[PDB]
Design a protein around this ligand. Structure first.
Ligand SMILES: COc1cccc([C@H]2O[C@H](CC(=O)N[C@@H](CC(=O)O)C(=O)O)C(=O)N(CC(C)(C)C)c3ccc(Cl)cc32)c1OC
Length: 333
């Protein structure tokens, strides 16, 4: 297989870390299609994140990015982010995009079109309402769940419903993204980014950065528990989504990020450490999750164990407590 494709996989393992292995394990035509999609989304995110590119330039770039996929020489050299290689060596990635079957090209192209429009819209603003929080996550994450679902169906490995049920696919992306947002509070803080919805945090403090002050920790934990309770509402769709899948490799691919984020939410729940640094799950814990998350009954047992754990930790003085109890009861039945 081509020097071109060999270099895509090198980029995959350089950026994707532990996740590259899951992708290289996908059956058939799926492997290359997801690998290229992953790198293309990496390029788009990198442009979005790069604070050293002006809005005035950034906007047409996000808007037109779906087009660059068809332009053999397009590359971008003016970026200062960690993953700049994918942008600098874009023609290699876009060459291999253009080799995919047309049915996979047109999925990827359409998703990037719609993501770029969306990402441009939030260059300006902060996330104000819970409803805006969902719209932001749709653009940066729910759309990737939809795109991947359409590759699975178009390849004929999964039923057409998987490709068409956009609400369930969207929830796959929103659960992961909200979990990252919740866990990355301090890192984003320090980096000058603000993604927690104002409508929620403003019930507690005058400014988002106040949660990092030691006198605010009781209010910080309460807000945290409230956002965690928000994210839990996606779990029923997650279980429905995973339950429809039939290809083993696609199942492992989808199930694994989802159990890691369940474990992450459980570690974060009522946890003051979120506001003091980076709560991560242990490597041994993560490896076992990866090994065990390979069939619905296992994945369902994991979900249930971690929810029981959150359940028994719910304090009665917490303002979200009965909402938390409620969604966990739903999940459980
Ligand atoms: C049906 O939908 C999916 C099914 C399987 C996996 C993912 C999703 O999983 C990783 C998992 C991953 O990338 N693991 C990281 C750990 C981490 O970054 O927190 C890693 O091991 O590097 C992830 O995080 N995102 C990034 C977004 C969630 C923003 C879309 C992502 C980016 C590109 C692709 Cl092709 C896929 C995903 C799905 O997307 C919803």
């Amino acid at each position: 297989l081509s020097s071109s494709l060999k270099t895509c996989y090198k980029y995959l393992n350089q950026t994707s870390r532990s996740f590259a292995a899951v992708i290289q394990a996908l059956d058939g035509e799926m492997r290359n299609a997801v690998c290229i999609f992953y790198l293309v989304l990496r390029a788009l995110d990198t442009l979005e994140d790069d604070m050293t590119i002006s809005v005035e330039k950034k906007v047409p770039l996000l808007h037109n990015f779906h087009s660059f996929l068809y332009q053999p020489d397009w590359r971008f050299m003016e970026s200062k982010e960690k993953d700049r290689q994918v942008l600098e060596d874009f023609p290699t990635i876009s060459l291999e995009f253009r080799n995919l079957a047309e049915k996979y090209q047109t999925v990827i192209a359409d998703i990037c079109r719609r993501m770029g429009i969306g990402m441009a819209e939030f260059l300006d603003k902060h996330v104000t309402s819970e409803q805006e929080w969902d719209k932001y996550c749709h653009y940066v994450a729910g759309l990737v769940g939809i795109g991947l679902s359409r590759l699975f169906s178009a390849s004929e490995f999964e039923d057409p419903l998987v490709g068409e049920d956009t609400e369930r696919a969207n929830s796959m992306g929103l659960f992961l993204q909200k979990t990252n947002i919740i866990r990355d509070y301090l890192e984003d803080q320090q980096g000058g980014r603000e993604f927690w919805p104002q409508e929620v945090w403003s019930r507690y403090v005058k400014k988002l950065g106040d949660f990092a002050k030691p006198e605010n920790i009781d209010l910080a934990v309460q807000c945290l528990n409230e956002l965690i309770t928000n994210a839990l509402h996606h779990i029923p769709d997650v279980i429905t989504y995973l339950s429809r899948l039939r290809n083993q490799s696609v199942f492992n691919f989808c199930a694994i990020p989802q159990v890691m984020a369940i474990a992450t939410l459980a570690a974060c729940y009522n946890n003051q450490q979120v506001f003091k640094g980076a709560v991560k799950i242990r490597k041994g814990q993560a490896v076992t999750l990866m090994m065990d998350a390979t069939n619905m009954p296992a994945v369902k047992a994991i979900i249930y164990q971690y929810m029981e754990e959150i359940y028994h930790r719910i304090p009665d003085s917490d303002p979200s407590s009965s909402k938390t109890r409620q969604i966990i009861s739903t999940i459980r039945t």
